[model samples]
Target: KRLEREQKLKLYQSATQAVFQKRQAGELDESVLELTSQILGANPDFATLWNCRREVLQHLETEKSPEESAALVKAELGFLESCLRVNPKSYGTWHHRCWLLSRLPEPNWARELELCARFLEADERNFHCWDYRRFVAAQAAVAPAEELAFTDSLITRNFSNYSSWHYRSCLLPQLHPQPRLPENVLLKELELVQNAFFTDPNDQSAWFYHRWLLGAGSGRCELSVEKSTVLQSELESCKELQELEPENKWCLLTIILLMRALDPLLYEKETLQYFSTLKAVDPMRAAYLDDLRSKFLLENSVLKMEYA
Candidate 1:
């Protein structure tokens, strides 16, 4: 009986695949998307089928009224939500939902971000949701101060979440405008980075972001060529430590302690290099590195301090 059932299911799946292929080839229109959704509902575990459904929905760009487009996007969100209900952990589904939301008009973004915030609260580790937060932040046109506050709050809630660290990277440039980086802002950013580093010394995401922040400031901060060169040398030492033991806690500990000793104003490169090399070896640690990067840049900026 089980064998018979399996054969029947495979036959149905094959038929569905053919229909999906036809839709992809432009032999059909949006109706095919509905059919694909049905097929996926019957086989919720079939990631490829779910992806096919999403593709069809995404390609639907026929001329339509504003209301019509809104409705269509909402429908796509509904389908994505259903998929999430079946498999909330599905990265593909979350990514598709984010894409759908991105296509909507900017006026709708606040609500969209609220929904994302709710989803993130449920699963703080979801990088997809964090990515979406940046997207919504971009669309929401949130104030830079508000963005910084949000970053601080996220770090307070879960210092271990690398996603939060990534979000901080996205927020920093917005918080500190160009041509006049402030010191106090830089100090706040550095504080957050230091906190993240202390929380998980081995995590490299914080470090990578720290480097980005340092490089991002152009020349407004107190960073100098001499400082950059010195840090580069220290980074070489950090690389040696990594080579000796790919997962040595002592290496991480030493780096963090060294980071603490360095003058935030002078050792931008060394501070950043230590974290960046670690991130290269351990990509998963990018969030922590990101946080560190944001903090370091903000702290070094003369503008950030004056404004604060």
Candidate 2:
């Protein structure tokens, strides 16, 4: 009886493995959902198999009733939670949970946002969680008032997170009630951008968003000769700082940011020459300068507006 039982267990394990492989290879038929169910029933520890089953259900969700879809998604969430209980570091499970949330109804988004906040508190570096936060924010269609505080909290937690920086970009325009440019708002954005620069000047992500805050969609004062001259002085100070620490990542990043801000004032030839000179100083940092130059040229062509 013992030998017979052992043979039966071996056969069952082989069948489960084969089914799993087929599912992974995308060779399993829709009907193989039954096999997946059986495998999970037999071995509840295989979280990956549960994830695979969730994927299959997602594909079928569109054809199912709203109630059916909700039930299945809830089940999927439960399975993912079980996986998380076993291994909180499982990025696969976290990502699968994000997918399930995406298919959930819009009304559920508020709760989803809360869940994302909880998850981020546990692992702020999870890129998947960051993405899910964005999705939840979109679904919630959060008012600017609420979004500002939430985004600011994220930035306070990790100023280095470019995702938070980008989220700020999305929320800031809406936060201000009036369309007209506010000096206070511009100053506030500048301060935030400066802080981000101080944190890691090499990160162009903050600088890019800063440009949008100051220029595009910004109701602020139009780019002017006076303002440009002030920026030029700031650039000079930045250059002096770069001289003090030629290898400073922040210094190099500031140069790129200043160049981006100044590109509107410089001719293409002048811009290209400026980049070439910077490249000569540090070839290692040349790529960012080159990329900025290309972006400036593209914007110049598109705008066809000469700078003062």
Candidate 3:
């Protein structure tokens, strides 16, 4: 294996030197593009090579006929596809693809979305692919409702799709923004997140989203009277889940977050009890939880001070 690796590196060095010489001499042309492609196909993380290809692409556009320029852009997309197959997580490869598409006279936005769907199918947690998917949708001006439905189907299949959950968070504000989130909209999200955590008590993704649902619509730490109605029922349901899964850290943790969001001053004691339990159940984060507990106590004390 070492011998094979050594030989591969030997070939890589020769190509890299050739590319460096051509690029140094300002020879940003077909030869340089081919050399850089060969290197990038094997080592997609080589950002310098990707930049060299970008320069060549830019040069070709100005120098070539319209038909030829379009052909070159298509060829670059094909080569980028090959590089991505070698390493789907390569930041350079994905970023270069985005740049190429932007410069295309006829960008196939749906094709890019399809590419992201395939990439995400292979690795659902690939934030690189998810980010690219977002760019494609935004560039294409895809309906927010459609994007939300895509996330819905993804999350329905797997309760642990963190990226899908996160994408939903981004989409919701676009579709349903108000003075504060409408009561009906808030309750829908609250119900949806509850079902997620209830389906898989161990997964932290849904639990984190659950915390977000309880957060103030104004992006503060506290909830208002309308949001509090949404919170109280969710608190009851989460407390029920706490009884079922006393050892599940996410359930306890979400309960703590919800309690504080509802009214830190009101649920201060109950929140403290849950925090102590959270420490016992998740001792590794006990110190961190204690610090969180301190914050909770301090905030309530200040609230008390203001009242006095």
Task: Return whichever of 1 and 2 wins on lDDT.
Answer: 2
Q: Could you estimate the TM-score for every candidate?
A: 0.55, 0.57, 0.88
Worst 10 residues of 2 by lDDT: 214-223
Question: Which residue pairs of candidate 3 clash?
Answer: none
Model 1 misplacement above 4 A: 1-8, 11-31, 39-72, 87-99, 102-107, 179-181, 196-308
The digit string of per-residue lDDT tens for model 3 on 1-308 reads: 87998988888999999999998898989998878877888788888888888888888778899999888887888888888888898899999988888777679999999999898888889999999998999899998899999998888787558999899888888887554455567778878878888888888898877777666355334456666776787778888988898889988888888777777888888998888889999999988998988888888889899884
What's the CA error at residue 14 for candidate 3, in Å?
A: 1.1
Model 2 misplaced regions, further than 4 Å: 1-76, 84-111, 173-186, 202-204, 211-221, 224-233, 249-253, 256-277, 285-308
Task: Indicate the TM-score of model 2.
Answer: 0.57
lDDT (C-alpha) at residue 151 in model 2: 67
Q: Count clashing pairs, candidate 1.
A: 33
Residue 109: error of model 1 in Å? 1.2
Off by over 4 Å in 3: 177-180, 218-230, 261-268, 302-308
Best by lDDT: 3
Model 1, global lDDT: 0.63
Clashes of each: 33, 0, 0
Stretch of 10 with least lDDT, candidate 3: 215-224
Order the numbered candidates by lDDT, best leading: 3, 2, 1
Q: Which model is ahead, 2 or 3, in terms of TM-score? A: 3
